[PDB]
Ligand binder design. Sequence first.
Ligand SMILES: CN1CCN(c2ccc(C(=O)Nc3n[nH]c4cn(C(=O)Cc5cccs5)cc34)cc2)CC1
Ligand SMILES: [Zn+2]
Length: 294
Amino acid sequence: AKEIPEVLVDPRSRRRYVRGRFLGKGGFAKCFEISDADTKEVFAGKIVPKSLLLKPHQREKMSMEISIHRSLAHQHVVGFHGFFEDNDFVFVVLELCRRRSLLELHKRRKALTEPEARYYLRQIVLGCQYLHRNRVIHRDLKLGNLFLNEDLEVKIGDFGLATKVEYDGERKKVLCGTPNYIAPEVLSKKGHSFEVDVWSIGCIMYTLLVGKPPFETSCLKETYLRIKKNEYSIPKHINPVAASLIQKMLQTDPTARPTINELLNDEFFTSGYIPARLPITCLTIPPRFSIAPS
Ligand SMILES: CN1CCN(c2ccc(C(=O)Nc3n[nH]c4cn(C(=O)Cc5cccs5)cc34)cc2)CC1
Ligand SMILES: [Zn+2]
């Protein structure tokens, strides 16, 4: 069976972590609230069995995820607070995001208000800007990897498909994994780089504003076909300024897309209301953004 220890001890740092509440599953890993024994601070513990890491290739993917994630420190990226292992498990200590992710928000609220979309997209773009200037491509930006802390701040997580650009102009030929919002250049296997993430943010923007993903079908391969043909439409109730930015990001040609550093200067952000924060009620009830209590 091989059960997870009730107390996770890091022998290098001499820190101990009591395994608290179960949070969920994702790939080979399980997620638990874990609490430092001395400071009582709580983290998300990502725990993956070494019994599912028997092949060197799977081991190397895990190592690479740690190597990338540990090098990152930004407000809109899931904090990496450490890692260690025993003979049976790999333990990664991550920033705890108590309000789950944008997937659970989307399932409850469907299409958000425009100001909410601006708020979230701004923080996603800021996180991705940081990744890209550090030559990191996430390659799997989706609603479920965009986690929310107690103040509804976005933190990009799951660097299991992420890769480092080692030299200028490098085109990655291989993506081992199946991204949700997969770019057309990946589907055709032509070569790809940072633009992959801008495509994904384009899909996220569409999903947040429209209430469903732009290329959704019954069959996943039929969906890949639609992405190849650029077969999507934006409903007419979507405001033209938002629709224009979606159209820029969802171009088949990767060079035609805007870069991540162009995005916040777009009219979608600069000409609209971006709230400084969102109340907790926004998880469940549309905000009207009233000027005063009545
Ligand atoms: C007890 N309830 C359950 C329902 N609620 C939550 C359910 C899940 C979560 C949650 O996943 N929080 C996370 N915080 N930080 C992270 C990095 N994560 C991953 O890398 C993703 C994964 C790492 C390992 C496997 S998947 C995932 C997180 C918070 C609350 C409220 C509390
Ligand atoms: Zn592979």
